[PDB]
Amino acid sequence: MPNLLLNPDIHGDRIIFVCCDDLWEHDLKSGSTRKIVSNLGVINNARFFPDGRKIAIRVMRGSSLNTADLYFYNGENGEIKRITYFSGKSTGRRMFTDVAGFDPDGNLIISTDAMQPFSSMTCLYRVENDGINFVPLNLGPATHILFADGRRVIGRNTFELPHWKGYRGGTRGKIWIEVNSGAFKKIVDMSTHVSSPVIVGHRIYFITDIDGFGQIYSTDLDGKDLRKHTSFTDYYPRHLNTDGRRILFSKGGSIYIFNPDTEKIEKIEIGDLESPEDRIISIPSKFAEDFSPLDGDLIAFVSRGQAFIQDVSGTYVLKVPEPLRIRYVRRGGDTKVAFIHGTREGDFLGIYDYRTGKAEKFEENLGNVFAMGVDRNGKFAVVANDRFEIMTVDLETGKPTVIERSREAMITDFTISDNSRFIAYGFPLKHGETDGYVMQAIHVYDMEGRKIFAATTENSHDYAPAFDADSKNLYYLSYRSLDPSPDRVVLNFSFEVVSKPFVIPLIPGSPNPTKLVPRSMTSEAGEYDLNDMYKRSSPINVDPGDYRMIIPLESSILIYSVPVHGEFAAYYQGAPEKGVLLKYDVKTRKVTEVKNNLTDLRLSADRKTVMVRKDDGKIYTFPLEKPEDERTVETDKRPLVSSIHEEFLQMYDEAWKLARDNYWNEAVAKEISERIYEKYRNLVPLCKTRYDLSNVIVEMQGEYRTSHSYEMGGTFTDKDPFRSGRIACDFKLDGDHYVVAKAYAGDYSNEGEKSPIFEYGIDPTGYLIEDIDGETVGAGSNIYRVLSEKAGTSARIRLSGKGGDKRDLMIDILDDDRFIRYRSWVEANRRYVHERSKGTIGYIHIPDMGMMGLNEFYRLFINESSYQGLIVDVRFNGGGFVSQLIIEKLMNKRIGYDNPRRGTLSPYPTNSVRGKIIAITNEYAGSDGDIFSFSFKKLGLGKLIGTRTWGGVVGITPKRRLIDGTVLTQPEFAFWFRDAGFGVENYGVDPDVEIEYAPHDYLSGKDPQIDYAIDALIEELRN
Amino acid sequence: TVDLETGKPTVIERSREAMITDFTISDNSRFIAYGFPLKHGETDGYVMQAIHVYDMEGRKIFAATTENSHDYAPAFDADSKNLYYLSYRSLDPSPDRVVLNFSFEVVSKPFVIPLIPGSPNPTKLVPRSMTSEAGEYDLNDMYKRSSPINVDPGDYRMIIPLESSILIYSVPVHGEFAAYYQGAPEKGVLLKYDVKTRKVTEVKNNLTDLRLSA
Amino acid sequence: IRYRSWVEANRRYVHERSKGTIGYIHIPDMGMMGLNEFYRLFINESSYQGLIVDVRFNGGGFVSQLIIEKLMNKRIGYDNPRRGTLSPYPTNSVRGKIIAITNEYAG
């Protein structure tokens, strides 16, 4: 049972590497191997100091390794010590805040975005007094820094990219070298991405796959004389490191050595190192998914691929006797439950009787199932798959029978009448093949006659069908009640509250029950007739809102409603959508609130029990009769039991299967998938930790050589995330005191855009921080750490300014201050542009193409669009999908004005730019950022300035998570530009005018991209 | 200001964009806070609005807030120590349910500004023993001391600061058809914000207009 | 009811006469009703080879600019999914040729 070895470093005969998230050292001389540091969290990088005594270590924390910081290790005494309290943000693909290199004097130089407004701005800092002080190098963003003959060698974006092999986009690793104690010149800029640079002698060795596979290469300190030193074919090599004589690296889970003076390569022998307990315990709630109420007040729920039948208290629990991957569980009868079991071949329907214990499992493959339901009479089930089919599965035999197939999207919204005769479901459709909107009409299937009827027309979005208990009327919801709501900031309108319920009597001549038409005056007593039933449709007199479910009851109707809300929290913090359960009294037509703070709701088969999840993440249950008597469903009374290796195999196979099933190109997916399966599967048994599996899974994802192949979430550690104490200030260790070097502020009047000290009416800049909460900080006291320990609370800060100017304030210590830095930056650039253009040019920055991008764009657009010129800076733009909505605004051509009796002119359109526009972009703008960039040029909105962009334009829409919560993404939607095809993918967008931002530009404190933008517009504005 | 004794009117300030109808007078009759419409450019498509404060003593005008958005409904607390007001600065988009679109529906939030530098936002409940106030009036750079009050963003039309609570008039998001073709009035509700428990509650609904005693 | 009936009649007519190759949208005014009707049909009629934008009898108002903006969107890309159909970029763009109809009652 060998281990997966990776990320090595060497110094003489000693070699340190990572195994089971812990750091190990191996001695070539004796062949001995030992663990020198552990239990710190997941370690992904370790770097020997010059002397080969101390070791800089990067360790990640937070269940999803969302945070990171650096530690020192002194091999002499075995002392460990945290050096940075930045709590840097990191992701698999972008594992920022690391060791950048060491200076001649042996000082550690780190790369971090911790104090920058943008994550890609991983600036270089020289560590001092072990974290007490940080000195900026001002060489701009950089991943590696080397020193050759007193010359600084800069590696930009030179980290490894295992998730995207063959990458040739604008963000590809490049190398620069100093030529004149400040003058820099780019020396290595190949077609492909260059990573892990090192210097042995007078040559730079790095990795690249310019030839189709990862190999080590090298060139002189001028980038000339290229040479290929390896010919690997099994697994890409990674993480180059050296001591000055030999080069170390990992491959296929093993450590190799490359001697440049011999060009000889050999695998170091390590063998078994650690095999932890395979059987692990987990908190069922942590991975809980799918919670459904059963007869007898029992509960069923899925967690980590396992299923359980339990009482609400969680005292009596039954595990479903079925191997890994149960996707869904559903009431199938008195004591029976149907479930969906997922394997590598696909999804299958199964049944389990928890009373007798029997549990048959059909072998008919249903495809990839995304919805499942059983009729009240336990005769058949209804299932939806990714083939866009809706079908019934005979619970007796197992024979699936397709009712209908949509060619636009999945048919997951359905319901079965109580007499098991009809099936109503939303049927996605389009009027035209290239239509920008997918409509949805409700369809009804009659088991007798086996014919499909149209419950509704196909002009909008109809959903949430529901039959009444008697099976006489079909209720459902629609977004057909068009009525606009005004925007409070921008001249705009949207449909916020246009949802309304409707009903359809299954017996013609029968009226809308909620209309309360006297029975004596209605001559019903007809029979079922679903023909032209969409013509009998009728609404129910309920105020329009945003409804997600309707449940018709005897003398009332329950409706789930979601108040209008912003999307920022849900978009960047996973914040759940808050709903409320309403009750509509059919007789009095009065509406009331039955339960709030809900995030999800399920209803019993007999409509008597209600199960819900609230905003606190907990699950509750209450009788529909007395909603005041709800109980909390306890699930953690019993530990979840599983096998690391069984899960790892299962997860790998699922990841591999998703990667294949969702890749945008089916043909390609066939060859790529089959050609990489076994190769990466062989490494799975060597994985003992989640982080191990990650290394394997991402590498197999890279095989698709496409963008947007990510791995998010998941549980890698149980260590609490690193914390960081921030007050939006920059400290400088001057003498033996810290002085506020800079006090950040954007718009003083907005929320959260300045240092909390400003609220006391003073600018902290220039003041000295005497102490925090009675503790002296300065020369012998790391202010970053002290703040670290007060994050999230208020601490008394003692400040000293000009003369006897002493202040004693309770300051809020933020957990983060990135946004404050960001807005400060934007307002700085905005002031700068107004001053350099003499008030003739506006400025707008777009951070991403998501909700934040929409906020920032308008935040300035409403004040900067009416200058003679306008700069639209989209540098560092994280992408998303709103580029089209922004381009639309910029596209507005001003063709008129409004002349008032009093006041000033009003431009028409209101949302139009007044003059010339100029766009600025760089290699850190990507995806929807690439699209916006290409678009700006294509529509001729203006000139594009900067450097070629990222190049990743194959979008994603994940719809599955691994049994551990992990969310993998698959490039499923290839963007095609007319007159460019898919060309932008793996290339990016070239600017009209290329303006590099070299390291010496940063040393001079000048932004060449923005200056050119200004100068250029000024030149264009002379007419 | 018009001297109620003689009748002599005295112009404080003039906007060149729109009327200055949103204003308030502190209880000690010393300051006058009002929304001042302005534009960055003459042909600008949007009119901004910043709150201005006029000091009867010194007869000088100060900038209570920056001019990057829409600030309104100024209100002084009875003690005349803090200036409360509202803003549409809390940008956060809401999705359209039919068309690929987004708009700013709930981006209104209240803010406060202490008239005495060094004094904290009263609703922050900073222990008095830990705050060294006891200063004097200083309206310079007061927009820098601005602070928000911890209330969920919404669509507020008025804020009334009271002793241990704050009243706020809120208007739920609604369609415009009825108001546009049937003169249908805008329905609001009067909310109460308890400064101590930070809990909000409904005081009165189905409101279309509200006035408050002296 | 008479109005929407009229609109659907003209809409059916245009689809039949162009043999399913031309869409139809009517804008009654430039107020809230106009915004409703424009989108009510825009989301289903914008992807035909051609599109007729009938603004006859349009009572005016002020949202002409917001509608013109939608019609100004030029389609320059597409989205290719593993399953399903193409998605146009921008989403709110007309696919083909546009033709406008107006009379002395549009003002």
Binding site: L491, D898, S906 | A73 | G61, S64
Partner: peptide, 11 residues
Amino acid sequence: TQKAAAELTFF
């Protein structure tokens, strides 16, 4: 009446 009763120019 309110502080958001929009007043735009009608045509």
